[PDB]
Ligand binder design. Sequence first.
Ligand SMILES: [Cl-]
Ligand SMILES: [Cl-]
Ligand SMILES: [Mn+2]
Ligand SMILES: [Mn+2]
Ligand SMILES: [Mn+2]
Ligand SMILES: [Mn+2]
Lengths: 462, 464, 462, 464
Amino acid sequence: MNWTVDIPIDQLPSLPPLPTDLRTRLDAALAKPAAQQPTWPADQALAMRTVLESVPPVTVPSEIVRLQEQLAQVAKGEAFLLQGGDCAETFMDNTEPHIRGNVRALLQMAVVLTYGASMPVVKVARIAGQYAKPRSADIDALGLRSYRGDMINGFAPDAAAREHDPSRLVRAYANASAAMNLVRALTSSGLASLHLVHDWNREFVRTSPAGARYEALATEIDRGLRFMSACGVADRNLQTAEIYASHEALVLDYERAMLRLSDGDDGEPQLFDLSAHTVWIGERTRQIDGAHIAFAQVIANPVGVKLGPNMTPELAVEYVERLDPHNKPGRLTLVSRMGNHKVRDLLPPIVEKVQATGHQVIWQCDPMHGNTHESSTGFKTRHFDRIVDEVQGFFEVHRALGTHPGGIHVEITGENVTECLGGAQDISETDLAGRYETACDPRLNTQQSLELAFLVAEMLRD
Amino acid sequence: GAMNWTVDIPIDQLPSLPPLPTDLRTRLDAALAKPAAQQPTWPADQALAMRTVLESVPPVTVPSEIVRLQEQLAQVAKGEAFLLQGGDCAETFMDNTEPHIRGNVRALLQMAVVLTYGASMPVVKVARIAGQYAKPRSADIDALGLRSYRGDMINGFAPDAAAREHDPSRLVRAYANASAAMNLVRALTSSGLASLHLVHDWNREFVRTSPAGARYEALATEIDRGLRFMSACGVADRNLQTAEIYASHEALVLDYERAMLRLSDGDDGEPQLFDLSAHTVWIGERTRQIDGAHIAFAQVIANPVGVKLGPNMTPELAVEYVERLDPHNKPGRLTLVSRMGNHKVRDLLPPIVEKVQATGHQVIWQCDPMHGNTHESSTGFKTRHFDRIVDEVQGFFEVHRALGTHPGGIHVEITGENVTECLGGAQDISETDLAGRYETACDPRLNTQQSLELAFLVAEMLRD
Amino acid sequence: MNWTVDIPIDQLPSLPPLPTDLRTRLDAALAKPAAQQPTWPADQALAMRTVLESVPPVTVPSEIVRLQEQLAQVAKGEAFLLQGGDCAETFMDNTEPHIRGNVRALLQMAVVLTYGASMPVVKVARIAGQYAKPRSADIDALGLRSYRGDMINGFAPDAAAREHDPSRLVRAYANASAAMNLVRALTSSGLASLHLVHDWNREFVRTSPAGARYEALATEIDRGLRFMSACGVADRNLQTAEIYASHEALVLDYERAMLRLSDGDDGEPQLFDLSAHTVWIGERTRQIDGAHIAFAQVIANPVGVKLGPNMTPELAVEYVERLDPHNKPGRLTLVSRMGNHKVRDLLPPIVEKVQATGHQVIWQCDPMHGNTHESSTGFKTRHFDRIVDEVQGFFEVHRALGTHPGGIHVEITGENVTECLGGAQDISETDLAGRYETACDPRLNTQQSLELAFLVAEMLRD
Amino acid sequence: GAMNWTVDIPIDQLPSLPPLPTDLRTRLDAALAKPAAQQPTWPADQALAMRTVLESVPPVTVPSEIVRLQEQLAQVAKGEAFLLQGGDCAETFMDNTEPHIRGNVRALLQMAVVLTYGASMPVVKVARIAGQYAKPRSADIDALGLRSYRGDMINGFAPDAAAREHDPSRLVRAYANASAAMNLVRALTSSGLASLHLVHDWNREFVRTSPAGARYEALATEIDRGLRFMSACGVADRNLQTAEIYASHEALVLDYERAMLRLSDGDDGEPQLFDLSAHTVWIGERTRQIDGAHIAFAQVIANPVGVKLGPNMTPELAVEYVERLDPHNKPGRLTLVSRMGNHKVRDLLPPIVEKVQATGHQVIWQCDPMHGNTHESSTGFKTRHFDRIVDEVQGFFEVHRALGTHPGGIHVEITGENVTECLGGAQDISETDLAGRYETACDPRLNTQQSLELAFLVAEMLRD
Ligand SMILES: [Cl-]
Ligand SMILES: [Cl-]
Ligand SMILES: [Mn+2]
Ligand SMILES: [Mn+2]
Ligand SMILES: [Mn+2]
Ligand SMILES: [Mn+2]
């Protein structure tokens, strides 16, 4: 009568517990305060975690130690990181076409950034779990509790949908798993083929209005590829695409339910978060003595920390001390998100002081989150131009210092959406109402995210 | 509602999907309007609701992997590869766990290296996994008086009436579980678990801790010297291509298979409907009515399919299944799965094979030695003797040598766990032992140890 | 007393004869008149051939059927031919440094031409046997019998050195074999490495005076390579360099002494000239009813015919009928050498008529031989500018017709010689006396031959 | 002058070549000023003329291939590869022909696949070829009264005085021939002759047409199932790396080796003198004087070297050869080649091996079972019994198992032709049979068939 189906969550027997020592450590760490947590009752949360402790993981430990070695390259200045995908994944759009479109977009950026940087690009999707977000107000504009992502409540704007229901924990796992399944299939398919991927770049250059501007680079990359193949490289000679899953580690009941211990064949058991390959802690949940930082300390996965305009060099050094106590290159990524009017002035002393610690972090640019604003026509938006200028400024600080602009972190879709302003298409304030589809922040659309790749490429070539 | 131990999914904001090519629609409706044996008895409206939820989820498999399976099966069909099919009789939601999945995968990779060495040719590996959650039943009421367990897609194993109701909510749980497991098998097959060298040191633990170990040793040593020869000639792990394990299950519940249909793109011809719940599916002895929906549905999908053939099979009906399901003469499109009993395969198969070979089509001939050799023990549990299974395969091989056709593969029920379900083996599991670790939700599976011991036994039939 | 050593030619037992049928055919073919043959007596020539009939070949049949398949690509428009090396090899300079320098030069041209054509480049060295040449006069300027190449007489300008001595037949074999030995070793060594090879191109661009002009292409190719390697290609993934030996088939006593029959494992025995992989017949020895054309007819090797300004479409069709009777793509190369003032007008009707035969020949440009002239300062020379303009004109005819400019055929050295005029260095008439080292025609030197590659690349990119 | 059956080469316009690094010059002159056994007795001025002709010709080998050989020999030295060395006792100009070269190469590739399979590790292949044209002699006058045949670099086989004069013109003929053959072996090893699969069907013709065939069959079948397993796992010809056969000869004639010295570039450290007449060279029992030129010359070149050690060897002198020739402790720089007799290897080798192992250097231990087991037949020809050769290798293996050191390889005299030079084998070649096809210019070689039969015999010693 209400267009809903109820799926019973199966109550299945448990596997053995994690060992008691690591449990003792994890418990000590999660007694710390945790910001932004759902407000569901403990018994229900407890119940839902118990279901997730025995489900097949989303990732496995070997992929994560592989990601760790690729990231060390990045930290040593010999590889570049690309991380990008939906601001918020929703369950409704966790469909083959949308997932295929974001995977394409990302591989499309990747070949352009690879040519331009002249080194490997490690590809990290914001996918298979980006279902939770913070909020600054518990009351939104409609006078409702805030949407906090599909792992927590519903986007629909009513009270019943907005209550925090922990059965969304198991709904998230399911969608994460199904999405992961599909990204592994698509990355071992013809979709990954370099030759394919950059014929899209060429359809892009034909159809775009700033197309004349990018033709030269597009033709060069093309000739690059034609030269690979003329020298006898065919696609089975490359070893296949690797696209890694990441999300913000926000909801501790989910992340800790997804903890596992590794074979001990690799060598030495340890705790991995198998909800994803790498995760990051956000600007609202990175309190130095908080449950999120503590949790990142305990997990073997590479981690990242979002660093905003209020950040001090001294808080940054503490992150490095807390999150890279063994000095492992690429274990910690520090993510700059300052605004394009501020990165040139604010980032430099942060880098100087962290570089002096003797540790090797990855410096990655997030040119989105610092540069958001509301248009006169209602919608929340970002100016493409300001986004570009932030990557520009981040490259300029790294050049001036001799450190390595390690990568970017961007919110993008393969959809032809009208969320961010400007770009070649100069989406205006008027155009935002046509296809404003984000469940949260404004995403660069397919064309804009590509255009940005071209522009970051020319930056890597200087 | 975690309060009601349910996940709540709304259907109303699932937005209309592209219509099918007109003919494909006409043929699909035509196939599904035909009588269908062994379907669940749940309401049409609840089913529909659940089908609609599954129409928009991520597929378990993609078309490119299915076209690739066809090319590999083509080779088996031409006598230049061999087919290994194996896994649980019935996967349950309860044991869809990393340990169980990983054991199953291991047992398959382990068998496959042995079979590769014995065959001197490639082995294609197709797991019964990520959807084998439905079974037929010859009687709707079981020995306890209860509506029969039909597998976890349909009802629950628990021996009570209420668990036995047919529940369409199981269509979405079966998918969730199927997705989750496929995601893990893909993770496993491109890890160190797939490296042939590790994979065969498990077989050597097996030879040393095994009552029949002295029997299988020479061949295990030979395989090992194979692997080291390979490596000594410069072949390293990353010079190989990583392992491919395909998913298969019986295509039984037409509500599930139809909701999992998808239409392929332009980049490989005219568009076609693929069943994206699996790589390849087969049709069982009870649902293989020549004019029924299962056969009709098999003819609309592009996947490789199989059909089970038991002891009342005729050479004439076999030919009819080949001309219906492989109408384009595409080798490896169709496997014929023989399951006769060991006391009958020697006499009943050859004429089915002569007549099929005469058509000019190239089917894969595969042996299912499980399902014709089942008996009930004196203690209470239904079981199969290991010697009868072996013998059926032996006879399946004598049939083909004598005709000069290709014994193309085996289809077995196995598990990575040392259950005590099948009598005999090196372990000589007795009737008394069967009470110990009988864990199957349906048929008796071969042991970790018995399923390996059988790879060794068939690897030597391949060598003669 | 005269600074000479006499090496006895060993009189060794024979192996079995070639089969009688093929012998009967070969004899019928060599009864035809043969121009430009040495004038040594028959008994001595006979004696020296008998020595060569049993010596290890210079090439083996499988390499030649491999060359045949690579050349078919070229003829079908999907690969480009580069052929280049000394105008005349001499024994004196058949040294590791000179051989290494010509092999480098050629691989250096090859990567530039590969990038520029966007398809494979088949590399054919004028080497391991280019020891014989024609002459138009039997009397040279010093009043001596003409130098005719080291397989025939000595370059030194005296009577005793200029007599035709057939012991030079066995001296040629030796030098050919030793040179071949070294090109196989160098092509399986680090010398072949794409990355190495084009760092020479970059030293070239730094040090050359037209360097600014070629920087862009040089940087692009560089980025191409850096992109290959960033995508995970390392040198063991390419399968190694293949440099084939060719020379003009001029001296029939040598070429027929080097005939062999193939295993018959490949399938079907047949006659191969195992003095080289491919050979060509020159403009002075290509009489339609002559011994050279007949000899090319009988051998399985790919062959080429030099076509000059006197050539008619109808003589060209006859070559195709004579030399490609089975319609095998790339069995016959037709080599255009017309002069840069004439190729645009003279080549086109030749191509039209041969293309209409339905056969698939390779059209290759020889921009050297048509464009030679003597300077006021004594030396015989060619103008770089005229050489370039000839390739230009050959590309223009092929474009206009829709046929495939299949390749070039050039006389080059790795030495820093001063033989050809102009180029970036603008070697003048005055500069020719500094390093005029050719035993015959003026070679493009290392810099000029590279510059020409760059220029032919830009032609292939239009 | 084809009139005088000579090729005439002028020396006067051979233009001065870069001087050597001062120390390298000093050390080279120092080594060559030391007494030198077994050198030809030709004039200094004619020699000089010929050395000058060879100073400017194309090398037989290039330095990169020699550094690559060292890395491969390092592995043998560490117990993870095996060394196969084989070819003619004496190459002659007369049989430096395609058929003869091709037979030799085949016989080596054939042995090498068998040995690879038996060792379960890589086999490095070093032919005696492209320069093995000189031999020592214990007496300058032979049984006919003639100045002894010293190999084709020095004089002629023909039994007449004038052919027996030492002729320095042979230094250039030896190079021409060496070049020509190396060119062909490089052509052959990157053709279909090198593909492992063809290469082992020759071994199967061998098993079927052979009196001992029933003996070697199981192992030939095993090898074949190895090769097909390899191919079934996706390994194709072009996924392998093509065959590498290295050239070696005894470094005997110091006029030849010194004219073939060359100096390496910058791109691998400080420049060094390489002997570019070969990949690796060894020093024989007669020229291995500790303070002599051969040893002194070995210490100046960068190539891997070997030294032969016969029955009057001490553990102390062996240590001295290791500290002189492998002064940098570089594994695989030095091979010690044991050639004791089968009746002595069991007792005389172990103490040489203990003392060498104690130094901390890593030599390759290689067995030459040919040169200690030679006798004169009752019919006229000097010969070796096949059983004695086998036994020496057997004992060489018992020495190393018992110490836990690595039996690193064999160094054998073989040919692709069925000569009748060595008594016994499966063929049981008798004394009477030896007259049939005795063709060697020096020592008795193993047959095509005997050299294969020995790979099988050693492959099984490697398996125990
Ligand atoms: Cl319906
Ligand atoms: Cl001297
Ligand atoms: Mn966002
Ligand atoms: Mn079953
Ligand atoms: Mn010329
Ligand atoms: Mn000897």
